Each structure stands twice: as structure tokens, then as C-alpha cells.
Write a protein that binds this ligand. Structure first.
Ligand SMILES: [K+]
Ligand SMILES: [K+]
Ligand SMILES: [K+]
Ligand SMILES: [K+]
Ligand SMILES: [K+]
Ligand SMILES: [Mg+2]
Ligand SMILES: [Mg+2]
Ligand SMILES: [Mg+2]
Ligand SMILES: [Mg+2]
Ligand SMILES: [Mg+2]
Ligand SMILES: [Mg+2]
Ligand SMILES: [Mg+2]
Ligand SMILES: [Mg+2]
Ligand SMILES: [Mg+2]
Ligand SMILES: [Mg+2]
Ligand SMILES: [Mg+2]
Ligand SMILES: [Mg+2]
Ligand SMILES: [Mg+2]
Ligand SMILES: [Mg+2]
Ligand SMILES: [Mg+2]
Ligand SMILES: [Mg+2]
Ligand SMILES: [Mg+2]
Ligand SMILES: [Mg+2]
Ligand SMILES: [Mg+2]
Ligand SMILES: [Mg+2]
Ligand SMILES: [Mg+2]
Ligand SMILES: [Mg+2]
Ligand SMILES: [Mg+2]
Ligand SMILES: [Mg+2]
Ligand SMILES: [Mg+2]
Lengths: 158, 120, 341, 102, 74, 319
RNA sequence: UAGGUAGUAGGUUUAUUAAGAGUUAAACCUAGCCAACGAUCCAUAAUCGAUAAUGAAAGUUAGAACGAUCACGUUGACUCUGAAAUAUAGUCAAUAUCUAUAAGAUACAGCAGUGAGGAAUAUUGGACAAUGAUCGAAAGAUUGAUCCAGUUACUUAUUAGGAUGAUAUAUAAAUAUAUAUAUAUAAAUUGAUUAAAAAUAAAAUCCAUAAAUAAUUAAAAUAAUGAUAUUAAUUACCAUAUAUUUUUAUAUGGAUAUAUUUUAAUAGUCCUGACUAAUAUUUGUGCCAGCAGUCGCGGUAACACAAAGAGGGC
């Protein structure tokens, strides 16, 4: 139907993509700074102003964001076997191989996701600065006086 | 297959022309219900090779599209592949011989072509 | 497809994509489409009647309406402004039926590999057509720019060649040919001088359109152009044919026939195993329809063709071959845009 | 594949058809005690010989087992409880406890 | 103009026009009623279908047979 | 106002008079016999000026308007012959001036009512070999051969492809006498292409007309401000038209600039093949959110626009 | 439907819960809260989409099919277990039926099927081969999920034959190549007497393919397993070698009597006064019979009724 136009004429839907990292990481410095920034007040403010009692039984401030330390996430989720146990049994060997592959996969997933997130912030920052510079250049060309401008009547003094 | 999160084929297409989505799904949901994620596609019918190609030595190819990175993540968090999906992942080189069974264990069968990773 | 009924009716006078004799007369006597005095609906209906008769008549109206594309494709010459000559208007609306030209059956007709679109469909359906080396047996297969398609040579010769006469039909032509040959040997022998004098005068009005004069010069070198009584004496009378005696026995018949032009074979049956008139000659009335398409490159020696592009409209020309003028196509386009409303 | 060799427990096809069970001893005339026929005939040939769907698939499964040195002992198909299937067990048991023990 | 009062299976009583030349409709005859009014008869807003139920097709109808429940002559 | 109109010839013809009751003839049938002329014992129409093909590279297309329906001529002298009161054919009383000086354009126009349809020029067997030998042996680019002989690049590429097929056919003696006879006959029916003749040369500056540009935008600028093709291209947010022409000339397989390598960046895996396996698995890397069959997509099977395609074997398959 | 609300609106405290709250229960306070931009009440309805229909579009319609969500499993309430259930469970009651007559069992909105209702919607089918689900260490078992087939023009698509084709005889000396072949005689269906046609329509001629027949035979699935299935497709004596985009071609080993299986083509339905495509006319009826979406038609030359001819759509 007409609705498909809004989505590239794609008919049907896919399940929403899950996020490997469910919270921001401790290396996403940009986000960490924003939450630490003082909250605004006034017309466009957020929070209870000084001297304004908050509702009894309610928390005055918002809960602190939980930043994930990928090193700690990896240490608690896919910890390595503490001892090199004797896997002489056929089933023990299969389990050891499967556990090793699973640990390799999930550690690569968490570290690739963190890298992607950090690399995406840098790319956006670079792209925005470029766009800003290009806009200034474009605007400067627009403001540049051409010879044709002499034929445009003007009343600058008035 | 066990667990609550399984990697299995969901059937699409028409009668007598099956195609499949490779999906991560809750064990209890319907086979063709919208899954957690769609990892790829499996077309079971091999591409037909012409008479000349056959003598030339061309082997029919079954085509699978798969997100290799996302699939590894789901194996990492304990998702359990179905038997057919297991065969596909072992052929792709994502899973290894630790996932083979006694009935399909090709312990002694000659390799005519070795898994080759290329760019195209 | 739509059943073929009364396609070549002279009263209706519809023009079809064929080389048929009756279809040539309908085209000859048409004298354009009359659109005067008709209301807008009547004009559109008439345009639809005429155009659809030629462009894809075998397609059902409902299928055609689905196939019909409102978007027409033209080209922009980027040097026009750098020429200085009076520019011509592009006939955009002659692209109304261009969507059909990419069909395999239409492509065969435009390549002159079949005598009509209907025959092209049967060639495709019977397994005689290949596209890019693969046998395609669906007339509705759509070609893409660069595709090469081929037709079995025997089928193309049967479409562009004369009809094979039957043994009985060709055996009555030889009987008459022998009678009219023995009359030329009785007039050459009774008064040889006049016949040779007439013979020389005929060769003056040949105009070079008749290659027989070129061959005749060879014959005059095989024997100043002065009369020779040895000629009349050399002439011999062929023996009459008893149709009943040699009836049902072709080898016998093709051993009792020996004419100066047709030797040891019945008329049109030099090789009865071939599916066409032998020796091969073009079908009657081929010149009026022999049009070389701008969108196909044809190799008649091998019966191969390449689909260069989809037909396009350019200043002063449309690559869509049509017997109808732009005003008729404009009315037809107006009809299908609104689904005949 | 290849033709396995007769053993002491399964000397001939008739012994093979008796060990697997599932009434497969009623096909002894189809095979004619020919060892090679049992290990060469595929489903298409067995279907042409009148073997029904269930039996021919079962034989081919046991032929593969024999070829791989896996046991060919009869495994029985499932059967409903004496007191009936779960959906009709409450009713059956109620009518069986009022006609046996009152 | 031949008409008929009919009690529909939903309890509504209507007046239906009987089309065609000649009809065998009587009281208690099972009829099928479709939409369509008889312009010159006020209050007759429906038509009975010829060749359905107990109403037979028009006898000896040659043209437009499908509209009068007449089967094709061999 | 509209009524059924029997398609009588627009030109004058001899209508039927009083008829014997058993003839049961029609005025359309008698008009056709007059167009065709007498039919000989061999089933031919020798008196009709269209029965036989031209052999001088000049198409013989119907000209009913210019000859006023007179289609009969002497089979050897090509001199007009018309029907007389006696029922015989003889010289016309007055020569037809409309048939002696025909415009060059009309000669190539097959249909009287459509002057926008013209026949194409046939390429001589020599020019084709020259083009074949320059692209393949000398190594010239299709752009060069196109700009040299005045042929569009797609046609140049097609000639190379077809000449290759004629060499294989001639190398295996597959071109029979009948095929040679037919080819020559058809060659002598069409006007031969002349690379030198400027009018015969094909335009080489044509580009497809986009749709966004098809609209008419107007800008009011200063009276002495220069505005050119490049400025217009920026306004319409399209590459310059000259650039489009240049990019369309580098598409030929033998043309300069032909390049295709930016796509060789998709990881592919070819699964191990073991003895006895009848097929090989090929895995192509994809991205979640793009790959897969979508859920709840529109079913078109019961709709007029149901998608129909063709597989590698040419078999019709539903998509 | 104009007033509604009385745990109603708010405050405080306890109980209960993993958890907020008149959410529930208890207590004590304040007099609030909603409402003509529609409260309360009544009626009706499962909701929606990157689904379907339509339109230039904004929109409108549907909610069958595909997918998402909710609710329910004859009706009501309650309880147990549990992370989660007022569970298709259990308890009690209601309605109906049944047999074993018990503080009994059953409730087809699971599949197939039957009666009823209705204008109207199908098999009491096959298989677990595939994809899944459950149990099992495994071997395996189960699966009306599912996959297949059956019924039904309900919808869509492909195919459902091309080229040639206005007559038949008799006719004509006794090979530098002819050639506008020419005469007689008979025959010629419906309409019509010329712009009145039916009609290239038919037959006939040429050449095909489908099916059949024969051989062969993928793929769905492999370690093995194929319900569909008398598989699709291909090939036309079969096999082989060489050359040979394809394809073609030659030659070979075996195979029949120099050739090699056979061979087609019966569409319906509506309409022709105008809107609205339909000019070749004619017969019956006579404001009757009937037709009709709108205007209207029919009272003896009816283009409109009922038909023949011819014609126009799909
Ligand atoms: K359309
Ligand atoms: K209200
Ligand atoms: K339903
Ligand atoms: K199963
Ligand atoms: K009709
Ligand atoms: Mg288990
Ligand atoms: Mg009527
Ligand atoms: Mg009209
Ligand atoms: Mg509280
Ligand atoms: Mg309350
Ligand atoms: Mg209280
Ligand atoms: Mg309801
Ligand atoms: Mg809605
Ligand atoms: Mg639904
Ligand atoms: Mg709604
Ligand atoms: Mg349903
Ligand atoms: Mg419930
Ligand atoms: Mg309930
Ligand atoms: Mg309950
Ligand atoms: Mg019920
Ligand atoms: Mg049911
Ligand atoms: Mg009923
Ligand atoms: Mg069953
Ligand atoms: Mg008569
Ligand atoms: Mg067949
Ligand atoms: Mg098999
Ligand atoms: Mg009358
Ligand atoms: Mg009318
Ligand atoms: Mg009438
Ligand atoms: Mg009639």
C-alpha cells in the first residue's frame, strides 16, 4: 500500500534489531560528559528548582545511568576456566571445544560493538565539522559580489 | 534442540518451492511467527548446471545469505541451532566438528574442495 | 491468448502485424484513420480499434491494460543546439505500445524471422527460439538491452520463403509449362527470324531490374548479334506429361521432366524434404513489409539478432514501427490512461 | 552403497526380516532370500514391488543400520495407554472403575 | 404487470416484479428475490430470479437467456 | 456522430454492376482482384508492382496515395498498366507526375500515414568486418569506432558479437545455400549505410531524458547574470548533461573507461565439498535488518500484477 | 441521554504486593472531581500494519488472505500450583447430553465430518520425506503443527495453430532459359442488384507442436530416509568418440527394415434509439405482449418489445 513508500517501498517488516550492549559503555566519554553536565532550570529546565519540595516518597533526582565496563562484562559473562582441567573424556573434550568457541565469539562481539560505537561517534563528529565548514564556504560564495549585482537596483542608504 | 533461544529455519515461499529464513526465535513461538532476528536466507534448491558446465566440472551451488558477525553473537550467548542450521554453520566455518553427531560424522570421506573465503 | 478470428476481413480493414496478402490490401486501401465528426469518445474508440488490431491483437484487453505503462521514454540530443538546422518535434505519443516491443514474439517479427507475430509465438512455443543460448518457449519473455536471440534457420526460411507446392499441385504446373515450352519451339522453328528479333527487343527494355539480360549476354557468348539458324534447330520439344501415369510416383515424375530452367525436379519441389519452396525464393509481397528495425541488429546469414535497446522517440522519428500517425496513437494513449473511461 | 557381508546372527535375508520385525517377515517372497537385492533395491524399486510406504522406509533404515554395524533389533511403534489416550483417559477410567471394582 | 408479494427468510415482506413473458409462480412457491425496482410500478422495488427455486425459466427464450434462466438449446 | 463504415478503398475502382445471381460477389473482393491483377497458372501475381522484391537497395514501399490505387505495371518494362473498358490492361492515358519525383524521405517511409517511421540502413559486409577487425585485432575502443563510422556504441558492440557468430558458423559450414540466398536477397532490399554520408550518420549525443528534469523550473536572476548548463545542473541536482553522455560512452564492453571493481568487497565463503556431495554451499555475508524474507509482505499471487520471472533454464517461475 | 460522581476528588496512616496508587480492605480528615471543545448514559464494534481496495492526491473502505496485538475455548465466580493463570486445570453452580447411577463423564471456536441457519464457503484424504515442537543418554517414539494431495473458475497467470487459401474440367509442336499463357465449357450456398454483404470465412494445400508411445530422469535430502508421485524436465532407436557460446556436425559401438514411434485442434456471454462501441436490412406484435441504469419505448413503415440477417464488446 501507500504506506510502504515511507520505508523504501519495502513490503513487510523485520523484527527490531537487538542491541548487543544494552547500555552505554564507560569508553563513550561523550555520553558520560552529557549526563554529568548540570541540568538546566527555568522555562526549558529539567528537575526540581532549589527550594521547591519534591513529592514525599519520591526521588528528587533521576536514577544514575548504568555504564557498562566491557572488560568487567567479559570477565563476569565468559570467564576463562580457572584450571586446565583434564579433559580425557570424549564428552569433556567436545564441551571444552564448544565452550572455547562460544567464549571467543562473545568476546569478539562485545569488543567489536564497543569499537563500532566509538568509531561511529568519531565519524559523526568529523562529518559534522566538515558539513559546517562546507556551509561556511558555500555561504561565503553566496555573499561574494559578482558583476551582475551592479544591475540590481539598491537603496542602501535608506 | 534445547533452550529458549534457538536458531532454526522458518519457511517462506510457495507450495512446492520452499525458501527459508534463518532466524533466532523463541522455542515456543510458531515456526513462521515474527522471530527475534532474521540472520539470513536459505534456498534449498541447487542452481541447475548446463550440460557443458557439468562436463566442464561445475558443481551445483546452494546459496545462503548470512550475517556472519550477528550469528556468532547469538552462538556466544547460548542460542541453540537446529540440526539443519547446524549443518549450514559447520559448512560456513562458523561452527566446528564439535557440533557434529555420530550419524553425520564424516570422519573418513575425501575432501574434493576446501573451504575458501573470498571477496566478491 | 485471444483466438484469431476474422483478422484479415476486408470490410473491417484492420491492419495486422503480418505479411499476408489480404493484410497488404487492407493497408493499401486504408487511406488513414478517419477522426472527423466524431465525439471525443468515438475518436478514442476508433484509435483504440485501429492501434490494438496491429499492436498486440493476440493480447486480451485486460492483460494489455495491466501491461500498459503511462511512462513514455524519449532521448535528448545534446548537439541539436550546436547544429543550426530547423529542429523537429519528438513524436512522444508513438511510444504508447513500445512496451510490447521488448516481448520475444514481437522481437522475432521485427527481426523478420517470422511472417507475423502469431507465427512468432508458435516458433517460440515449439522450441525453435533461443535467447543468449538458452531455449525460451514462452512468447511473453522480455528481452533486455544486449540480449541475443536466434531462430532455427529452417523456420526463418519457411517464413520468408514461398510456400512449398504439393506434388499434385506442382505436377499440373509442369504440364502447363511443357505445353507453353513446345509453343515457343514451334514459333521459333516456323519463323525463327521474328522470334529472335523479338528476343533482342525484349532485352533492351530490361532496365537492369531483370538480371536475365546479364545471363543472356553470357548465352550470346556461348554460341555482332546476328541470327543463327542453328538456334532454332537446336531447340527441341519436351515430351507431354500424363498426370495419371506419373500420379503418386514422384521419382518417376522428376525423371520425366527436363526443361531448360527446371531439370529433373518438379516445380517448387527441388528438395521435397525441405519445408519451403525449393529452390528457395522470397515469399510474395515481401517488399512492402520489409522494414529494418532501428532497435535490433540482425544477422540473416545465421538468423541471429541482438536487442540493442528499447525503442525510443527522437526529434522527427519514433523507433516504434507503426502504420498509424501520431494523432491516432495520441487518442489511443488517452483511452488507456483512464482505463477506457 | 556397498554390499555388507552376512553375519552369524543375520545369515540371510529371512533372518534379517525376522529380527527387524514390524511384520516385515511377510516380504520374504518379495526379496527371495537374495542378499544383494536387500542391499541394492532403493525405495523406487521397492514401491514397484508392492512394499507399502511404512515398511519400505523401515527396511531401508534397517539396511543402513546393518551397513554401519548398528543394531537392527526391532523397535516397536508407540501405543496408547491401557486406559486410553490422555484426552479420553478421564472418561475411560471412570467407566472402567465402575464396571470392574464398583 | 405481473408482480408478487413475497415473505423473505428474514421476515421482510416485499413486492417483486416477475420478468419475462409468462410465469408459473403461485402461492407458496419458493422464489429468490434480487435488487432492482420496477420503474413504472410504485412500491415494487425488487425482482424475482427466473430459473431459481420454483420459478422456471422463460419458455422458448432465445436471446439474453442468462437473464431469464433459459438453458442453451442443443 | 459515428456509424459502422465498410473499409472501401479511398481511391476510385470499378464497382460491381448487374451480377449473375450465383456470383455472390462483393465490392471489396472485386477491388482486391483489381489491386492484385490476374493470377497466373503458377499462383503468382506478376502484374502487381509489389509481388517481387527490389534488387537495387531501394525499398519498394506502397504508395497508394501517389499512384491513386494503380498498382499494376508490366513485369519486365516496369511501365504503368491500367484497366480499360474492354477488361484488359494497357498504358495509362496520362502519365502520373506524383510518381516520378518522390522525396528521398518518402522512399524510406514504409507506411503512407506515418512519416515518423523510417527503415534503418543495412551495414555492408565490409564495414562489419572492418569494425570487427578494429575492435578485436587493432584494439581500438568502441568509442573510437563509434565516432569514426557514425554508429551508436551499442550497435558497434552488437556487430562484433554477431560477426563472431558468423565466423563460427562459416568455420563449421553451417551457412547453407538457402541462407546465403536469403541473406543476399534481404541485403539488396535496404539502403546501405554510408559512414561518409553525413545525413546517414547516427546521432551520437543522445542521452536518456530523466523524470525529475522533465518538469519546467524557471529562475528570475539579474538581467546580466550568466546562467549555463552547469548552473542548471546544480539547480536540478543532476550531473552535467555532458558528463552523462561521457559516462554512457564508457559502458560498451570494448569501450574505454569500462570499470567494475568497487563491488568486490562482499565476504563470500564456499563450503567444503566432500566426495559424494551433489552440491556446494555458498555463503554471502549480509546484514541483519536487510537480509531475509519480510513478514507480512503483500501477497500478489491472486492479483493482476503477480510477479512472473524466468530462471536460468528459461522456465517460467513465480517470483 | 444534561447534568454526573459519594471511594466519588484530594490529604494522612496501616494492611496487602517485588513494586507506585481509593488498586483492594480498615480508620481519620478536607470538599472536592467530571461536563455544551459533550460529562454521565445508551447503542454498535475485536484493534492495527511496511496488508488489501480505491483515488491525481489529501483521504475513504475493508480488517478474508499475510503479519502484529488483545480477548475467549458451553456460562459465572472462586481457589491451587507457579516468575506469570480467576488456566481449555481444580472447586461449586448454571445449561445440555450421555452411561457406569457415581458428591460420574462430556461440551469439536484442534482436524475431518454431520444437522441447523443462510444467497453462499471444501476431504469423515496421504505422509511424518521436508521445516518445526514434545519425550528420551541414545537407539528412537509422538505430532489433523506442518508438508502434500482432494473438492470448488472464488482470484491471478500461462497455454488453448501457424503459413497458404476464392472454383472445376477440357485445352495447345509431333533444349542460347520459356514466360503478362490464352481459349472454350460447366459450376457457383444465405442475403442482396451494388459501394450489401456473410466471406479468407469454409474446404483444400504446406509445415508444426501438445498428448500418446519409448527411453531417460533431476531437485525438494541426505549418513540414510521422498508423502507429493504414474515427479518436473529432457530426448526421439540407445550408447560412445571427436570437433562443436549456444548449438552444430562427423564418425563410430550396439539396435530395427538404404532409411528409422505417432500425431491432433467445434467458446461462451452481453449488447447494437441517446448517454455508449455497434448503417445491410427484414419479420411478428400493435399502449397488448413486454423492455427499462437515466431519458424513455410499444396505439399497424417499432433502429428500444419478441426474433432472422448483419454488426459491436469482453
Ligand atoms: K497498466
Ligand atoms: K456523549
Ligand atoms: K474463514
Ligand atoms: K516431522
Ligand atoms: K460475440
Ligand atoms: Mg534432548
Ligand atoms: Mg433485453
Ligand atoms: Mg454509437
Ligand atoms: Mg495508599
Ligand atoms: Mg475507584
Ligand atoms: Mg475507607
Ligand atoms: Mg461483537
Ligand atoms: Mg482504518
Ligand atoms: Mg485476518
Ligand atoms: Mg474499523
Ligand atoms: Mg481465517
Ligand atoms: Mg480463559
Ligand atoms: Mg469462561
Ligand atoms: Mg475451567
Ligand atoms: Mg461448541
Ligand atoms: Mg471443525
Ligand atoms: Mg438451508
Ligand atoms: Mg494423520
Ligand atoms: Mg438467393
Ligand atoms: Mg510429450
Ligand atoms: Mg532418494
Ligand atoms: Mg413492424
Ligand atoms: Mg439499448
Ligand atoms: Mg430488440
Ligand atoms: Mg443472429
Amino acid at each position: 500500500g501507500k504506506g510502504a513508500a515511507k520505508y523504501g517501498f519495502k513490503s513487510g517488516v523485520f523484527p527490531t534489531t537487538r542491541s548487543i550492549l544494552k547500555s552505554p559503555t564507560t569508553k563513550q566519554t561523550d555520553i558520560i560528559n552529557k549526563v554529568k553536565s548540570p541540568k538546566p532550570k527555568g522555562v526549558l529546565g529539567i528537575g526540581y528548582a532549589k527550594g521547591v519540595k519534591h513529592p514525599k516518597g519520591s526521588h528528587r533526582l533521576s536514577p544514575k545511568v548504568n555504564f557498562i565496563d566491557v572488560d568487567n562484562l567479559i570477565a563476569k559473562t565468559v570467564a576463562e576456566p580457572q584450571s586446565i582441567k583434564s579433559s580425557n573424556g570424549s564428552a569433556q573434550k567436545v564441551r571444552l571445544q564448544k565452550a572455547e568457541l562460544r567464549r571467543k565469539f562473545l568476546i569478539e562481539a562485545f569488543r567489536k560493538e564497543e569499537a563500532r560505537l566509538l568509531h561511529k561517534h568519531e565519524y559523526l563528529q568529523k562529518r559534522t565539522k566538515e558539513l559546517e565548514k562546507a556551509k561556511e564556504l558555500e555561504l561565503e560564495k553566496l555573499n561574494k559580489e559578482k558583476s551582475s549585482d551592479l544591475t540590481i537596483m539598491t537603496l542602501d542608504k535608506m | 534442540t534445547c533452550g529458549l533461544v534457538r536458531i532454526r529455519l522458518a519457511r517462506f515461499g510457495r507450495k512446492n518451492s520452499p525458501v527459508y529464513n534463518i532466524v533466532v526465535a523463541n522455542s515456543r513461538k510458531a515456526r513462521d511467527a515474527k522471530p527475534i532476528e532474521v540472520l539470513g536466507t536459505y534456498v534449498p534448491v541447487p542452481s541447475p548446471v548446463t550440460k557443458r558446465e557439468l562436463k566442464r566440472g561445475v558443481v551445483p551451488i546452494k546459496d545462503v545469505k548470512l550475517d556472519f558477525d550477528r550469528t556468532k553473537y547469538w552462538i556466544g550467548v547460548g542460542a541453540q541451532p537446529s540440526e539443519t542450521v547446524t549443518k549450514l554453520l559447520r559448512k560456513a566455518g562458523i561452527l566446528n566438528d564439535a557440533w557434529a553427531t555420530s550419524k553425520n560424522s564424516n570422519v573418513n570421506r575425501k575432501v574434493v574442495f576446501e573451504r575458501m573465503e573470498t571477496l566478491e | 491468448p485471444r483466438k484469431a478470428n476474422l483478422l484479415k476481413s476486408l470490410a473491417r480493414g484492420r491492419v495486422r502485424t503480418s505479411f499476408n496478402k489480404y493484410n497488404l490490401f487492407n493497408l493499401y486501401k486504408k487511406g488513414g484513420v478517419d477522426l472527423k465528426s466524431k465525439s471525443l469518445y468515438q475518436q478514442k474508440w476508433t484509435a483504440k480499434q485501429e492501434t490494438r488490431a496491429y499492436h498486440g491483437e493476440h493480447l486480451t484487453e485486460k492483460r494489455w491494460q495491466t501491461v500498459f505503462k503511462p511512462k513514455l521514454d524519449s532521448v535528448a540530443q545534446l548537439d541539436a543546439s550546436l547544429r543550426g538546422g530547423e529542429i523537429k518535434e519528438t513524436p512522444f505519443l508513438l511510444q504508447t505500445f513500445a512496451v510490447l516491443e521488448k516481448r520475444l514474439d514481437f522481437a522475432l517479427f521485427r527481426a523478420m524471422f517470422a511472417s507475423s507475430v502469431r507465427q512468432a509465438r508458435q516458433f517460440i512455443l515449439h522450441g525453435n527460439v533461443r535467447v543468449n543460448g538458452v531455449k525460451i518457449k514462452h512468447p511473453s519473455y522480455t528481452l533486455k538491452p544486449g540480449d541475443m536471440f536466434s531462430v532455427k534457420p529452417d523456420k526463418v526460411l519457411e517464413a520468408l520463403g514461398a510456400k512449398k507446392p504439393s506434388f499434385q499441385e506442382a505436377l499440373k504446373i509442369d504440364k502447363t509449362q511443357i505445353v507453353l515450352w513446345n509453343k515457343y519451339v514451334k514459333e521459333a522453328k516456323t519463323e525463327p527470324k521474328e522470334v529472335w528479333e523479338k528476343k533482342l527487343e525484349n532485352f533492351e527494355k530490361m532496365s537492369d531490374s531483370n538480371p536475365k539480360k546479364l545471363q543472356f549476354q553470357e548465352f550470346l557468348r556461348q554460341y555482332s548479334l546476328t541470327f543463327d539458324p542453328k538456334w532454332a534447330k537446336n531447340l527441341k520439344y519436351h515430351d507431354p506429361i500424363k498426370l495419371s501415369e506419373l500420379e503418386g510416383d514422384e521419382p518417376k515424375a522428376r525423371k520425366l521432366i527436363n526443361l531448360p530452367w527446371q531439370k529433373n525436379y518438379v516445380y517448387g519441389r527441388q528438395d521435397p524434404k525441405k519445408p519451403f519452396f525449393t529452390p528457395w525464393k522470397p515469399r510474395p509481397f515481401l517488399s512492402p513489409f520489409a522494414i529494418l528495425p532501428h532497435h535490433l541488429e540482425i544477422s540473416f546469414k545465421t538468423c541471429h539478432a541482438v536487442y540493442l535497446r528499447d525503442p525510443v522517440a527522437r526529434p522527427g522519428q519514433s523507433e516504434v514501427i507503426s502504420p498509424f500517425d501520431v494523432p491516432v496513437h495520441e487518442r489511443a494513449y488517452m483511452y488507456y490512461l483512464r482505463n477506457g473511461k | 552403497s556397498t554390499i555388507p557381508k552376512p553375519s552369524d546372527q543375520v545369515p540371510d535375508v529371512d533372518a534379517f526380516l525376522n529380527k527387524i520385525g514390524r511384520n516385515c517377515n511377510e516380504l520374504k517372497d518379495t526379496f527371495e532370500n537374495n542378499w544383494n537385492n536387500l542391499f541394492q533395491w532403493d525405495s523406487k524399486i521397492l514401491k514397484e514391488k508392492g512394499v507399502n510406504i511404512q515398511q519400505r522406509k523401515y527396511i531401508l533404515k534397517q539396511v543402513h543400520n546393518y551397513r554401519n554395524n548398528r543394531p537392527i533389533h526391532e523397535i516397536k511403534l508407540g501405543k496408547k495407554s491401557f486406559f486410553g489416550g490422555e484426552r479420553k483417559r478421564k472418561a475411560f477410567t471412570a467407566k472402567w472403575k465402575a464396571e470392574n471394582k464398583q | 404487470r405481473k408482480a408478487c408479494r413475497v415473505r423473505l427468510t428474514n421476515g421482510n415482506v416485499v413486492s417483486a416484479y416477475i420478468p419475462g413473458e409468462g410465469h408459473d409462480a403461485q402461492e407458496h412457491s419458493i422464489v429468490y428475490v434480487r435488487g432492482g425496482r420496477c420503474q413504472d410500478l410504485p412500491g415494487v422495488k425488487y425482482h424475482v430470479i427466473r430459473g431459481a427455486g420454483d420459478l422456471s425459466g422463460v419458455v422458448n427464450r432465445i436471446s439474453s437467456r442468462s437473464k431469464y434462466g433459459a438453458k442453451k438449446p442443443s | 456522430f459515428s456509424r459502422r463504415r465498410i473499409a472501401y478503398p479511398f481511391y476510385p475502382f470499378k464497382k460491381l454492376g448487374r451480377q449473375h445471381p450465383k456470383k455472390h460477389d462483393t465490392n471489396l473482393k472485386t477491388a482486391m482482384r483489381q489491386f492484385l491483377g490476374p493470377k497466373n497458372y503458377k499462383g503468382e501475381y506478376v502484374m502487381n508492382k509489389y509481388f517481387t522484391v527490389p534488387t537495387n537497395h531501394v525499398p519498394n514501399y506502397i504508395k497508394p496515395d501517389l499512384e491513386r490505387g494503380q498498382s499494376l505495371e508490366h513485369p519486365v518494362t516496369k511501365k504503368p498498366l491500367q484497366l480499360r473498358y474492354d477488361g484488359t490492361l494497357g498504358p495509362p492515358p496520362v502519365e502520373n507526375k506524383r510518381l516520378q519525383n518522390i522525396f528521398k524521405d518518402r522512399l524510406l517511409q514504409p507506411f503512407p500515414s506515418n512519416p515518423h517511421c523510417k527503415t534503418n540502413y543495412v551495414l555492408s559486409p565490409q564495414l562489419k568486418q572492418s569494425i570487427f577487425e578494429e575492435i578485436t585485432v587493432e584494439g581500438l575502443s568502441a568509442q573510437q569506432v563509434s565516432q569514426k563510422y557514425g554508429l551508436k556504441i551499442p550497435r558497434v558492440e552488437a556487430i562484433v558479437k554477431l560477426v563472431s557468430v558468423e565466423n563460427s558458423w562459416n568455420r563449421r559450414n553451417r551457412v547453407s545455400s538457402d541462407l546465403k540466398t536469403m541473406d543476399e536477397t534481404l541485403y539488396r532490399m535496404f539502403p546501405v549505410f554510408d559512414s561518409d554520408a553525413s545525413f546517414k550518420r547516427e546521432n551520437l549525443s543522445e542521452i536518456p531524458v530523466p523524470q525529475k528534469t522533465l518538469a519546467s523550473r524557471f529562475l528570475t536572476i539579474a538581467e546580466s547574470e550568466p546562467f549555463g548548463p552547469v548552473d542548471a545542473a546544480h539547480v536540478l541536482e543532476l550531473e552535467p548533461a555532458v558528463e552523462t553522455l561521457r559516462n554512457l560512452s564508457t559502458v560498451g564492453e570494448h569501450s574505454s573507461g569500462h570499470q567494475q571493481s568497487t563491488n568486490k568487497n562482499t565476504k563470500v565463503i564456499y563450503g567444503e565439498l566432500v566426495e559424494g556431495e551433489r552440491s556446494q554451499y555458498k555463503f554471502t555475508n549480509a546484514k541483519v535488518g536487510k537480509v531475509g524474507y519480510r513478514y507480512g509482505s503483500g501477497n500478489r499471487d491472486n492479483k493482476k500484477d503477480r510477479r512472473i520471472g524466468f530462471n536460468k533454464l528459461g522456465q517460467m517461475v513465480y517470483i
